[PDB]
Amino acid sequence: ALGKLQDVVNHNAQALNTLVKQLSSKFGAISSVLNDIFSRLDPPEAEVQIDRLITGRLQSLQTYVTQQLIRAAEIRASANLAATKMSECVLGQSKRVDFCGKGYHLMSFPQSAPHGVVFLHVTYVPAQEKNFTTAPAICHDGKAHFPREGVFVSNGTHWFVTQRNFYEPQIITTDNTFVSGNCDVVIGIVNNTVYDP
């Protein structure tokens, strides 16, 4: 579950552990303790031994710092992503798919984890389907009849105009249905009535 923060912590700890362990490395030099080098060699050669050791250790610090720069850049990308997620989904309702949850989005709740943030995207998912016979327009009186908002479906014999994301049939009336043109150009136009209130 929490792998995406556990890895942050473990990578930081591992980098520091490697940086510490580098102290024992010799880098070709006779030993990795400077006092022994000073108290066992003459200054001219103690000089070069220390030179090599300093170069190695400084280069180790340098690579540590560069790796940290790159990790910080990637974490800043994730922090910009988290800021956008909190703004767009905690403080609103997002309209872009798969940004704030698999499915249609309703809300979101933040929870503060150590070195991170956790969101609880409360989404909406349709479950149970039922096939139907659908027709783009209904030619009542020669004129076509597009559904004002919804799809045309037929439970076999009768036609209803339901919404698209939750089956809920209503009888056809002039308020579900707007008209534009005539039933001579569109294909799949059908013949039905449109009750007038």
- Least distance to another protein from the beta carbon of 183, Å? 11
DSSP state of 178: E
Residue 139 CB neighbours (<10 A): 20
> Which neighbouring-strand residues pair with 110?
119
Ranges within 52-111 binding another protein (CB under 8 A):
52, 54-79, 81-83, 85-87, 90-93, 95-99, 101-104, 106-107, 109-111
Residue 157 contact, options another protein, ligand NAG, none, Cβ 5-8 Å cut-off depending on partner type: ligand NAG
Q: Which stretch binds ligand NAG (CB under 6 A): 37-45, 81-89, 92-100, 186-194?
A: 186-194
Site for ligand NAG in 111-130 (CB under 6 A): 129-130
Angle between helices 3-21 and 43-85 (to 10 degrees): 170
Calculate the alpha carbon distances from 1 to 6, 7, 12 in Å.
Answer: 9, 11, 19
Residue 124 or 195 with smaller CB distance to another protein: 124
For 5, the token pair is 């923060």
Query: Which is closer to another protein, CB of 4 or CB of 193?
Result: 4
Report d(CA 83, CA 86) in Å as an integer. Answer: 5
Q: Which helix (H) or strand (E) is 151 found in, with range? A: strand 151-154
Q: Which conformational region is residue 188 in: left (phi greater than 0), alpha (psi within -120 to 50 degrees), or beta?
A: left
- Binding-site partner at residue 1 among another protein, ligand NAG, none, CB < 5 to 8 Å by type: another protein
| 131 counts as binding ligand NAG under rule CB under 6 A | yes
Amino acid type, 89: C
Task: In angstroms, give the least distance from the CB of 105 to ligand NAG.
Answer: 18
Is 39 near another protein (CB under 8 A)? no
Is the distance from CB of 125 to CB of 102 less than 8 angstroms? yes
Contact set for ligand NAG, span 154-183 (CB under 6 A):
155-158
Q: Which residues ranging from 113 to 142 are in contact with another protein (CB under 8 A)?
A: 113-137
Which entry of ligand NAG, another protein, none binds 10, CB below 5 to 8 A by partner kind?
Answer: none
Whole-angstrom distance, CA of residue 172 vs CA of residue 175: 8
Instruction: State the residues that interact with ligand NAG by CB under 6 A.
Output: 129-131, 155-158, 187-188, 191
